[PDB]
Amino acid sequence: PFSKKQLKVLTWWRKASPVSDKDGIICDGSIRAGKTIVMSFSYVMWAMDTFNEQNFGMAGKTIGALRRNVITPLKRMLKSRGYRVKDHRADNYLTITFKGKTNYFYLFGGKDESSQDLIQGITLAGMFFDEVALMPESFVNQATARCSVDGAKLWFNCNPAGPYHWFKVEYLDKLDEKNLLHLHFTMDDNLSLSKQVKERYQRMYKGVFYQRYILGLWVLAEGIIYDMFDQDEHVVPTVPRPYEKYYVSCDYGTQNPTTFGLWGLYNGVWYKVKEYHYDGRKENKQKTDQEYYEDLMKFIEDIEKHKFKGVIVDPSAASFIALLRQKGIKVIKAKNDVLDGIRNVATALNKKMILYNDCCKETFREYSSYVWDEKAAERGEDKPVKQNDHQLDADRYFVNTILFGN
């Protein structure tokens, strides 16, 4: 059952609509708001109805994310309303056919400055951007320039960043200058969610991430990053427990500190059992891959080897990963996306999915000093100041790699 706002997304482009003159539409706001599915479905509906034998673009942060977030569920919905879809998996495009009409839908990723160059020779009757605020402005300009065919429209879907972000200042604050519609969504616009489910999603977020992902507000990131960390709630005594499973998580440094964290599952909660912290700068003696391999074996001497499920390491420590696999130790590549990892660590703390033994003392010193970069925020980037973060980067790899899936 669709809300009034959802129906506006489905109908704005029709001849009967007063706003069909507009060059495009922007939908922003909270998570779980039911905006992504109707936006992608209305995009296809619009394109099949208005053109034939034409090319259309669809882009996300990565192709993988676009398929997971948009394309997979869009195909299920299109099939149920009688659209026929041939997915060209290796070529990354779709052929869609409906009431004797046929159009083609090419899939893109937008990651950086190089992204604009990736395709400059295709010609398009339209462009759809999922998670536009995580894309480089350069890519969005390149792709808009390829929309040369007459009657072409631009479609934008996102959640908020901060208020100096290029998409907020150049697009949302210049609506009439670009001739765009704007609709803003919260969870009240998704009628398929009960009041009990909405409250469970609310409790995943506090502070800045609550303001962005629940209230749908473009608010500045400022000061202490993990301002929900609370020594009355998140710290427990250093005592033996009957853990069912273990991992180690690592932040590799030679000219900087290396760290390990031992993590143990027990009654549906992952515990940071203890921490390793070697500062090579302060000791006046740097360490080799071999020496860190040795220290890691000492660090895990006392655990049942059948319960130890491997080391989580960043791909940039490729030499270290090679030595570990040579010695028979399992290795898991860290999902290292910074802003996502930070958001998920905060959610883990908010729901007490993780807890810390009181021996993790360097980790706690970092929790009270890790801050957002104020200068970057005023330029529209959300970035941590890269200091006092060697335990916390490893904790982030653990949370983002093991506790969070899709």
Numbering used by the authors: 13 to 418
Paper quotes:
Most dsDNA bacteriophages and viruses utilize a powerful DNA translocation motor to package their unit-length genome into a preformed procapsid. A central component of the motor, large terminase, consists of an N-terminal adenosine triphosphatase (ATPase) domain comprising ASCE (Additional Strand Catalytic glutamate) and lid subdomains, and a C-terminal nuclease domain, connected by a short linker sequence. While both domains are involved in interaction with DNA DNA translocation is powered by the ASCE subdomain using energy released coinciding with ATP hydrolysis. The nuclease domain is responsible for cleavage of the genomic DNA concatemer at both the initiation and completion stages of viral DNA packaging.
Subsequent soaking of these crystals in cryo-protectant containing a high concentration of NaCl resulted in a transition from R32 to C2 crystal form (Crystal form 2) with each of the ATPase domains of the three subunits related by the crystallographic 3-fold axis adopting a unique stable position. The final α-helix (α6) of the nuclease domain is followed by an ordered extended C-terminal loop or ‘arm’ proximal to the ATPase active site that contains a bound sulphate ion, which was present in the crystallization condition. Initial attempts to produce diffracting crystals of ligand-bound complexes of the full-length protein failed, despite thermofluor data showing stabilization of the protein in the presence of magnesium ions and either ATP-γ-S or ADP (ΔTm of 7.8 and 2.3 respectively), Inspection of the structure containing bound sulphate ion in the ATPase active site showed that in crystal form 2, the C-terminal arm of the nuclease domain occludes the ATPase active site and likely requires significant reorganization to accommodate an ATP analogue. The C-terminal arm, residues 418–427 of the nuclease domain, lies close to the ATPase active site and thus may play a role in ATP binding and/or hydrolysis. Indeed, closer analysis reveals that this ordered extended turn contributes to the active site through an arginine residue (R421) at the tip of the C-terminal arm, that is in proximity to the sulphate ion bound in the active site. Additionally, the carbonyl oxygen of the preceding residue, L420, formed a hydrogen bonding interaction with R44 of the P-loop of the lid subdomain. Superposition of the structures for the full-length protein and the truncated protein (with bound sulphate or ATP-γ-S, respectively) positions R421 close to the α-phosphate of the ATP-γ-S. ATP bound in the monomer active site cannot be hydrolyzed without the participation of the trans- arginine finger from an adjacent subunit in the assembled pentamer, which requires significant rotation of the nuclease domain with respect to the ATPase domain. This monomer conformation is stabilized, or ‘locked’, by the C-terminal arm.
